[PDB]
Design a protein that fits this description.
heterotetramer, A: alpha+beta, Alpha-Beta Plaits, 3 helices, B: mainly alpha, 4 helices, Non-structural protein 7 (chains B, C), viral protein
């Protein structure tokens, strides 16, 4: 696996170098979010009202993407439907405040639909 | 004839990166990556090519143990 | 970090073009295209990457019925 | 094969578009020669004195690449060893002249070695 892994590390380094050369707003968004631990759980859909599930690691990333019931991601707007914690317990949108932030079981999971 | 050729070349690499991560073991998911790879190559305008590229790239980003993006930036910042 | 990334992306496409031409049926030739594909990705300077790219591209050009280069230039000159 | 061929024509068009964007002297040489019918018969070797076999369609392409016993191809010099015609009959280097050109059985085959 030693000879095989060196080719994998070389092809993956080339992959993101090409993506970095594209400089696409929607591509840079999902890559930068993935760097902060904000990764999707399924294939990002393109049809309207389709399910998307993203992970939000900390509260500082939540306010950067969520505004009210709208969720901005991949250069698109998403209508939030469910919010759960690490124990699969549904969390209301009113609980997520700056005062109640360190009381929830981070990270959370947002199930939203495309606009 | 434009940047369109750079996105289509990258989509072939991304599908090759997935197949080296042994994604072909899932006939359900591999057929979705193949069909998106075919959609990008047959796209006309850049808008359809990039949006399909987002769906294909999200497949890679959805696998936690596959790639740590912070690791590749370290190997990149050490050489520059 | 340079044009080096454009040659390595193209070599992945060229290997993918060969595999779609069903070159994998020859274990002797496919192992040579795979090893050249691995040599380009692991190359350090651009001189070694392009010279290995010449050997890999010559595999495609050596197959007469595979690709007529004049045909692709017609589909390219008609659209431009 | 109709759906599969459209992807093949799309990937091959992208392949040469990338090669055209590279603008490499050795890459442009073998592609332009292949357009004129001057195609290699085996993998272009990189080691010295290794065998290379190229096809030369007409006499106007011969003088563009061959000078004496030296053969220029892929941005490299090659020492010619054998020259045969369409009937596998070995042709000497002295026969290939402008006066005896339409008498040979074109195309020819050159077996040369790297310098």
């Amino acid at each position: 696996e030693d000879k095989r892994a060196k080719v994998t590390s070389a092809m993956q380094t080339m992959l993101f170098t090409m993506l970095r050369k594209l400089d696409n707003d929607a591509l840079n968004n999902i890559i930068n979010n993935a760097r902060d631990g904000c990764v999707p759980l399924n294939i990002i859909p393109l049809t309207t009202a389709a399910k998307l599930m993203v992970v939000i690691p900390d509260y500082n990333t939540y306010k950067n993407t969520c505004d009210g019931t709208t969720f901005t991601y991949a250069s698109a707007l998403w209508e939030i439907q469910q919010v759960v914690d690490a124990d699969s317990k549904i969390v209301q949108l009113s609980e997520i405040s700056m005062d109640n932030s360190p009381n929830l079981a981070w990270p959370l999971i947002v199930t939203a639909l495309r606009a | 004839a434009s940047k369109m050729s750079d996105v289509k070349c990258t989509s072939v690499v991304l599908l090759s990166v997935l197949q080296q991560l042994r994604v072909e073991s899932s006939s359900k998911l591999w057929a979705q990556c193949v069909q998106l790879h075919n959609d990008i190559l047959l796209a006309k305008d850049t808008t359809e090519a990039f949006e399909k590229m987002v769906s294909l790239l999200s497949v890679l980003l959805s696998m936690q143990g596959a790639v740590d993006i912070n690791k590749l930036c370290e190997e990149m910042l050490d050489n520059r």
